[PDB]
Design a protein around this ligand. Structure first.
Ligand SMILES: OC[C@H]1O[C@@H](O[C@H]2[C@@H](OC[C@H]3O[C@@H](O[C@H]4[C@H](O)[C@@H](O)[C@H](O[C@H]5[C@H](O)[C@@H](O)[C@@H](O)O[C@@H]5CO[C@H]5OC[C@@H](O)[C@H](O)[C@H]5O)O[C@@H]4CO[C@H]4OC[C@@H](O)[C@H](O)[C@H]4O[C@@H]4O[C@H](CO)[C@H](O)[C@H](O)[C@H]4O)[C@H](O)[C@@H](O)[C@@H]3O[C@@H]3O[C@H](CO)[C@@H](O)[C@H](O)[C@H]3O)OC[C@@H](O)[C@@H]2O)[C@H](O)[C@@H](O)[C@H]1O
Ligand SMILES: *[C@@H]1O[C@H](CO)[C@@H](O[C@@H]2O[C@H](CO)[C@@H](O[C@@H]3O[C@H](CO)[C@@H](O)[C@H](O[C@H]4O[C@H](CO)[C@@H](O)[C@H](O)[C@@H]4O[C@H]4O[C@H](CO)[C@@H](O)[C@H](O)[C@@H]4O[C@H]4O[C@H](CO)[C@@H](O)[C@H](O)[C@@H]4O)[C@@H]3O)[C@H](O)[C@H]2NC(C)=O)[C@H](O)[C@H]1NC(C)=O
Ligand SMILES: *[C@@H]1O[C@H](CO)[C@@H](O[C@@H]2O[C@H](CO)[C@@H](O[C@@H]3O[C@H](CO[C@H]4O[C@H](CO)[C@@H](O)[C@H](O[C@H]5O[C@H](CO)[C@@H](O)[C@H](O)[C@@H]5O)[C@@H]4O)[C@@H](O)[C@H](O)[C@@H]3O)[C@H](O)[C@H]2NC(C)=O)[C@H](O)[C@H]1NC(C)=O
Ligand SMILES: OC[C@H]1O[C@@H](O[C@H]2[C@@H](OC[C@H]3O[C@@H](O)[C@H](O)[C@@H](O)[C@@H]3O)OC[C@@H](O)[C@@H]2O)[C@H](O)[C@@H](O)[C@H]1O
Ligand code: NAG
Ligand code: NAG
Ligand code: MAN
Length: 549
């Protein structure tokens, strides 16, 4: 096309500096078929005001094109209303000063999967080229604040697959350059297989004769077990944990020693991850992206962090951690030894119904900050050395004080929380929880009687309305799934995995239809143990439920 404005060209190194840090508009234009098709409503522009006001500098804009094609071979014409909607949203972002990265997203596995046995790699490459030519035509006159990203986490298993991903980068660069406008000088993000650090390192090969300023983008979702709540992993922050994280990132940077690198998506989601672990994890990831000079962009599906209807960040602590790579954060300590028979977290004051109200000492990692003040969610400010003292790295709360919030007999549930202001960094939040062992509506069922769908089991939450994990054992001792978890310690063995096997909502614990299929195929009554926070042992704060067959 023929452009009218000015385009203030910017180097890839400068673009990557200036986006630090970003936020993903997840589950919006990448949702299928349409933008309101999943959990998010139609995209509204106040969202980017919230994002800017939080300290983000850029918005990553995932877009799924799959269901907006009006023609197939040979032209693969994109719905011109979809092209205009994407252009409109980019205008919403850049007009507020936020940099944008727009991509091709869930198309990666919906039609552009090179690893799937019956893929017309010919056809995939044409459609991809036609797609990015039409994208690149519509956006050709966008300013230098808008970058293009080749394709999201493309499936890639072997080195021959990885060579195909390299072609994707080349096809992309050719199409957007044929499109014209300012595209020849637009910052682009090239990708490796799965946007995985090791696959990018193993198989990425820079497009020959590349003329665009470019940067590398990868996604980080490790360690799998803590990030995806697999096999009962609810702690994070040990020497080996931090080492596994720093090594993974360092191996990527060592292989791309002078390349601008964008960490395009990462998240320990507040939905499923314990808060003290999650804050330790985000703090450390931020510490490492500073070390290895990578620009982070947090993944947010709309339920993870910002509530676009209210502007409340569900987890303001992570956002503080991520929006300031130039600050030291004081964090609550927590168990990190997976062989410990009890798990504690200073993100909570816990009190069990029916037990006496005691003093609570919360060990914290101060990191040479000082505690300035504490304010409860009712607006009352606690009196230092009266409602709390600080001994070493321990913050201690007197029983007389805490009993003004809960008693031996008050109802379970979330009481107010305490916000700790420090010398510097984020303000962590300690959540008072009055807890009791939950109770389940049913204690067993026939597999036949509950098939046709998932198993939703009504529950009386008593404290935290969160499922920590679910243990699963056939009547004869064998693990229902994943026998290797027998090396995972007291809180790991025979446990199963969030979303794949279990879930929960405001009123139920859920075993997925997949899990009830495992019980059928095992031909045995198997016992599920639902587990809740606090994880004070492996039995007390748990409820049992067996599945007959
Ligand atoms: O918060 C996590 C939690 O969400 C719970 O879902 C409730 C909520 O979901 C809405 C729709 O979710 C889609 O799944 C999305 C997911 O929400 C999203 O976060 C995820 O992000 C990816 C991203 O795309 C990647 O590029 C990269 O960034 O990794 C992200 C993953 O991040 C994970 O770890 C960090 C956390 O921050 C994240 O929350 C966590 O998810 O993308 C998925 C999309 O999944 C597809 O793309 C990635 C690919 O690898 C997957 O294999 C692929 O999955 C396929 O998706 C198909 C699409 O339709 C299909 O489901 C296939 O079966 C599946 O294999 C769901 O895909 C979509 O169905 C949800 O929309 C609702 O669906 C219900 C019924 O299905 C409808 O009734 C309703 O109208 C829709 O809104 O909002 C609605 C609520 O009902 C959900 O419960 C979820 O239950 C829970 O398990 C967690 O995932
Ligand atoms: C310390 O304590 C304080 C108080 O004691 C805590 O404050 C509480 O913080 C909560 C979250 O931080 C906050 O909840 C939110 O309140 C707002 C304002 O009224 C409300 O809109 C929010 O509801 C959304 O979020 C919840 C998840 O928390 C969703 O389950 C809910 O459905 C809402 O999400 C829907 O709308 C979003 C915006 O559009 C969508 O993105 C989302 O996908 C979902 O969409 C569905 O419904 C839509 C219609 O709503 C529909 O369009 C769509 O298609 C989907 O079907 C949320 O409740 C509390 O308000 C706040 N409490 C108080 C008293 O202030 C604080 O967090 C504590 N701090 C810590 C660290 O623990
Ligand atoms: C760039 O990134 C890569 C990938 O992340 C980094 O390489 C990995 O580094 C880790 C730790 O340094 C290695 O882990 C150890 O590997 C030992 C040997 O692994 C062999 O088996 C692999 C599987 O087939 C094979 O790929 C690998 O080939 C490599 O080494 C050969 C001999 O040293 C050499 O012939 C090849 O050219 C190739 O470089 C090995 O034969 C294993 O025994 C240990 O137990 C441990 O797990 C990974 O294996 C490495 N993966 C690779 C190389 O694919 C690399 O460090 C990064 N570079 C920088 C500068 O940071
Ligand atoms: O599932 C699609 C694609 O994912 C790549 O995995 C990458 C990715 O992880 C994100 C992705 O992980 C899947 O396992 C989950 O099912 C999905 O919900 C989640 O969004 O980014 C970081 C990498 O560590 C990871 O390998 C695969 O590599 C790719 O082959 C393909 O399978
Ligand atoms: C329990 O039954 C399963 C069903 O196949 C079997 O595989 C397993 O061997 C049995 N348990 C033991 C300890 O052998
Ligand atoms: C659950 O069942 C196991 C044995 O099947 C038992 O050891 C454990 O104490 C039970 N716990 C609860 C809370 O029912
Ligand atoms: C874990 O450990 C803490 C102290 O570090 C206790 O307060 C808690 O009850 C649990 O045993």
């Amino acid at each position: 096309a023929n452009c009218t404005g000015s385009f203030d060209a910017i180097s890839a190194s400068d673009f990557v500096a200036n986006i630090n840090p970003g936020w993903n508009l997840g589950n919006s234009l990448d949702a299928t078929p349409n933008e309101d098709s999943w959990n998010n409503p139609t995209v509204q522009e106040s969202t980017f005001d919230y994002v800017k006001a939080a300290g983000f500098k850029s918005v990553r804009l995932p877009v799924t094109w799959t269901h907006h094609f009006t023609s197939e071979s040979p032209d693969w014409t994109v719905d011109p209303k979809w092209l205009q909607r994407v252009s409109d949203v980019i205008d919403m972002i850049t007009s507020r000063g936020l940099y944008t990265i727009v991509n091709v997203h869930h198309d990666s596995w919906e039609w552009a999967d090179v690893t799937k046995s019956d893929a017309n790699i010919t056809q995939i490459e044409q459609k991809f080229e036609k797609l990015w030519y039409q994208i690149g035509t519509k956006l050709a006159c966008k300013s230098s604040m808008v970058a293009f990203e080749t394709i999201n986490e493309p499936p890639c298993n072997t080195a021959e697959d990885g060579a195909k991903i390299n072609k994707f980068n080349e096809i992309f660069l050719r199409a957007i350059n044929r499109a014209g406008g300012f595209n020849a000088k637009r910052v682009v993000n090239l990708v490796g297989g799965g946007m995985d650090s090791v696959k990018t390192s193993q198989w990425f090969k820079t497009p020959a004769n590349i003329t665009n300023p470019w940067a590398l983008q990868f996604h980080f979702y490790s360690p799998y077990d803590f990030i995806f709540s697999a096999w009962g992993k609810t702690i994070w922050g040990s020497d080996s944990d931090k080492s596994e994280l720093d090594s993974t990132l360092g191996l990527l940077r060592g292989n791309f020693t002078d390349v601008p690198i964008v960490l395009g998506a990462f998240d320990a989601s507040p939905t499923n991850t314990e808060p003290a672990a999650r804050w330790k994890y985000h703090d450390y990831l931020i510490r490492s992206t500073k070390k290895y000079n990578m620009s982070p962009i947090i993944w947010d599906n709309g339920l993870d962090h910002l509530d676009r209807s209210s502007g409340i960040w569900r987890d303001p602590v992570s956002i503080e951690i991520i929006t300031n790579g130039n600050e030291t954060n004081s964090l609550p300590d927590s168990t990190v030894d997976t062989s410990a028979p009890s798990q504690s977290s200073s993100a909570y004051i816990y009190h069990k119904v029916g037990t006496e109200v005691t003093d609570q000492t919360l060990p914290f990692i101060f990191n040479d900050n000082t505690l300035v003040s504490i304010q409860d969610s009712k607006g009352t400010t606690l009196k230092a050395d009266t409602d709390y003292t600080v001994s070493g790295s321990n913050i201690t709360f007197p029983a007389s004080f805490l009993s003004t919030y809960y008693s031996e007999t008050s109802e379970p549930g979330l009481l107010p929380n305490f916000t700790l202001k420090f010398s510097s960094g984020a303000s962590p939040v300690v959540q008072l929880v009055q807890w009791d062992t939950p109770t389940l509506s049913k204690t067993s069922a026939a597999a036949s009687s509950i098939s046709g769908s998932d198993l939703s089991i009504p529950i009386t939450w008593k404290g935290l309305p969160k499922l920590a994990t679910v243990k699963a054992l056939l009547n004869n001792g064998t693990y229902l799934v994943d026998d290797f978890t027998q090396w995972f310690g007291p809180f790991g063995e025979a446990r199963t995995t969030y979303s794949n096997q279990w879930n929960w909502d405001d009123k139920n614990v859920i075993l997925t239809q997949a899990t009830v299929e495992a019980v059928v195929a095992a031909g045995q009554d198997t016992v599920f143990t639902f587990e809740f926070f606090p994880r004070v042992d492996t039995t007390t704060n748990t409820v049992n439920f067996t599945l007959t067959v």
